[PDB]
Design a protein around this ligand. Structure first.
Ligand SMILES: N[C@@H](CCC(=O)N[C@@H](CSCc1ccc([N+](=O)[O-])cc1)C(=O)NCC(=O)O)C(=O)O
Ligand SMILES: N[C@@H](CCC(=O)N[C@@H](CSCc1ccc([N+](=O)[O-])cc1)C(=O)NCC(=O)O)C(=O)O
Lengths: 209, 209
């Protein structure tokens, strides 16, 4: 520490890392970049890949949202108890990221026309996570193992924004419905989810959700 | 171990993990799935996210090409000396994946009409890796730290397929050109790159490159 998140004023690719920090009792500084500032063109060329989020952990400046999530999982002890679990958490997080990539293309590129067929295809994309939960202690614990990991925060975020996009999307997925309810009830996640900083923040940059 | 890779008969998302295993003196079994077998639809339902590669390490089965690379990096000690190094290696590997995703889209969906544009844009996508090498020992060693990591094999593969797509794309990048030459001359990678198994395997599934 100290932690600083530098990002556009939306939830986007930073809400899972914000919930992880909040749940782990950490505080962070939020450095909000408006689109007007971004378009001035002074910040982008200092960003490694020209994009945000940018994250500072003391001395270390990181780019790439999943690299920042894996860093926090490693440093705060949220990456499993052995190599087998760590491997399974990476497999889960990469599946989360692939669906997040599709969700972002829908939202920014083809919301009006694409929404119907996306929501239709969504059960096929949610089914892997339901199967992983049934394989792990019958769905009663976390996505991998017995303790929360960086992968749980990213999957919870993905499921929460999907419930806004398609309200009944988890009705046929009992373990995933219960999981979302269970993790949302964690004292510090519930407090974060009710915070005005979270509530006032739009999910995406273009008003679609 | 034992190690088995289950994939289509192409280089695609498996050539970097094959170069990693070869360079670390490991042997593995290739289970080849043809397009015609895949189309029959009996194996796809058994894959967690309905896709390949599938990788077996002893009794651990894994999916997602980058979760397989991170697993091999962690179990074979190619993931840095400390936490700062591990986070930088994830940042590099996520930047490689981003450009790999762009490359895949060009090849499979818009090769004839998008090639010129892609190649015009490519210097701006390669410049971060040139910059990362110059900050690491003036570009004389690996991409992060002083030992090879899983991320080096993935960056090496990406650069090699881009030299086929746009011959001379590394002309203006002296540290990346030197880097490709240095890693390609490592005797076990050198052997692998001239092996008929590698040479006879198409880069992609549609015959474009
Ligand atoms: N792989 C990177 C991808 C980062 C990414 O796509 N960054 C976007 C922001 S998230 C998507 C997004 C876009 C716009 C807004 N907005 O409020 O205007 C919000 C979120 C960006 O920096 N775009 C600026 C640019 O490319 O110039 C990661 O995972 O961190
Ligand atoms: N995120 C996953 C992405 C996996 C992926 O794109 N898999 C493709 C193969 S790699 C790209 C590719 C596509 C086609 C061929 N081919 O020979 O026909 C080869 C490679 C696939 O299984 N496609 C089959 C399906 O979805 O039904 C990863 O990183 O592992």
């Amino acid at each position: 520490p100290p932690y600083t998140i530098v990002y556009f004023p939306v939830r986007g690719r930073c809400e899972a890392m914000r919930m992880l920090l909040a749940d782990q009792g950490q505080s962070w500084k939020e450095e909000v970049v408006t689109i007007d500032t971004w378009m001035q063109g002074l910040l982008k060329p200092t960003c490694l890949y020209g994009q945000l989020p940018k994250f500072e952990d003391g001395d270390l400046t990181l780019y790439q949202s999943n690299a920042i999530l894996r860093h926090l999982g490693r440093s705060l002890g949220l990456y499993g108890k052995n190599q087998r679990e760590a491997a399974q958490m990476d497999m889960v997080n990469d599946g989360v990221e692939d669906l997040r990539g599709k969700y972002v293309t829908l939202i920014y590129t083809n919301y009006e026309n694409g929404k119907n067929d996306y929501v239709k295809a969504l059960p096929g994309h949610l089914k892997p996570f339901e199967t992983l939960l049934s394989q792990n202690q019958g769905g009663k614990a976390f996505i991998v193992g017995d303790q929360i990991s960086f992968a749980d925060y990213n999957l919870l975020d993905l499921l929460l924004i999907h419930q806004v996009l398609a309200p009944g999307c988890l009705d046929n997925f009992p373990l995933l419905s219960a999981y979302v309810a269970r993790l949302s009830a964690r004292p510090k996640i519930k407090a974060f989810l009710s915070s005005p900083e979270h509530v006032n923040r739009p999910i995406n940059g273009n008003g679609k959700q």
